Structure formats: C-alpha cells, structure tokens
Amino acid sequence: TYQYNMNFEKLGKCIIINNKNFDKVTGMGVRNGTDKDAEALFKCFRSLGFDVIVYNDCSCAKMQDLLKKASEEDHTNAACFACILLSHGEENVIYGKDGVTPIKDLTAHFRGDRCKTLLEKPKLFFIQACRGTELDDGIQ
Amino acid sequence: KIPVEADFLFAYSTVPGYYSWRSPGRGSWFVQALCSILEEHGKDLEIMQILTRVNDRVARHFESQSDDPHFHEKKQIPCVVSMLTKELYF
C-alpha cells in the first residue's frame, strides 16, 4: 500500500537521448564515451522491463517533440515512464544539437494535468550533464 | 485531487552549480555507477536505495585524471530530487 502499483501489462516506455555531436555554433566539443553509456543504459533498462528507444544527436526541436509525443501516448497499461538525458548542460538547461533548452520545459509534458495516463505513476528523469562550472576538490 | 508536479523523480549526475565528469574511454561516472548498481540490485531494491548506492559509488570510486592542475584530482557527488509519493520497486 506504500509502494507504487506495478500490476500492469508492461513496465513502461524508456526514452534515451544520446547527444554526442553538436553544431560548431554551440562551441561544444564531442562527448566521447557517451556511446558506451547509451548502450549500457539500453541493456539495463530493458532488463528492468522498459521498452527502451534510443535517439542520437537530437536538436532541441527534436527533444521537445520526442517527449511531447511520448506524453500524448496511451500509458494506461504502463506502470511508469523513464527518460535518460545524456548531453552537455548548464544550470537548469540541457544542450541539444543546435542550442539549449531548459530541463523544466522538457519534463513539463508529463505533469499530471498534461499527461493523465501517467497520473499517480512515477515519472523518472535521469540527467547526465553539467549544472555549472564549480569544481569539487573533495577531502579525506 | 493531487498536485500536477507530483510523482516526479530527478536523478541528476551532480549537484547544482557543479561540473559533471565523463571518461572518454569508459563513459560518464554517473552512468557507469548507475548501470553497475542496476545490474546487481535493480529488481530487489527500492529506487531510493539504488540511487543512494549510486551516490556513494560516484563519491568514492572516482577521481578526475586531467592535464590541467585546475581540473586534476577532482570529485563528484550526484543529486537525487524526489517528488515521489510512494516507494518504487521494479
């Protein structure tokens, strides 16, 4: 009674956005190693039971359309939704192939009033990106 | 009636204001750890137990290797943001 209901026909959809290459105009360099990440994530989340789809080097338009389209799907027989974002980023924003888009713009499609079929179901967002330019020197 | 901003969870690879680290040869620290934990305990632990164990792994088992004395021997701690109203098991 204190756990999310999992008795559904499928665990849910999982969208992986894998941004490796960026337009010169962004001045962002190649994210070498992210291909290793995306396939690893692919193996793990399909193992959990997600029906996972990978997209590469998405534009901001592409990223917005992807999650919006997903939010307009029928999640009646899904237990949850998950989205993994692999890209460059700064505070509150994430880099697309052609520029930046705020993360809250991307996840707002899955708000309770905009995605009824995912209501009272967990919406998971995993984000691999910078959130600023401070460094953690650590200590022992 | 329930809040529209409810039942979200944000697993950030790092805290606000801070850099996120990646190894060109093995991948980003966060995703490496995340996948490692999810392979072992993905089906027998609650999601917050999993992410807590991810936080621990990134903090301890990673240290930046860099040319630049400004970017060398640096650390990272991920950042979990939960708006969940129940426990999550896969």
């Binding site: 994210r31 070498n32 980023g89 990106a129 | 850099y19 680290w21 860099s66």
Partner: peptide, 4 residues
C-alpha cells in the same frame, strides 16, 4: 577526463 572531460567535463559536461
């Protein structure tokens, strides 16, 4: 090692 590179940053994001």
């Amino acid at each position: 090692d590179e940053v994001x």
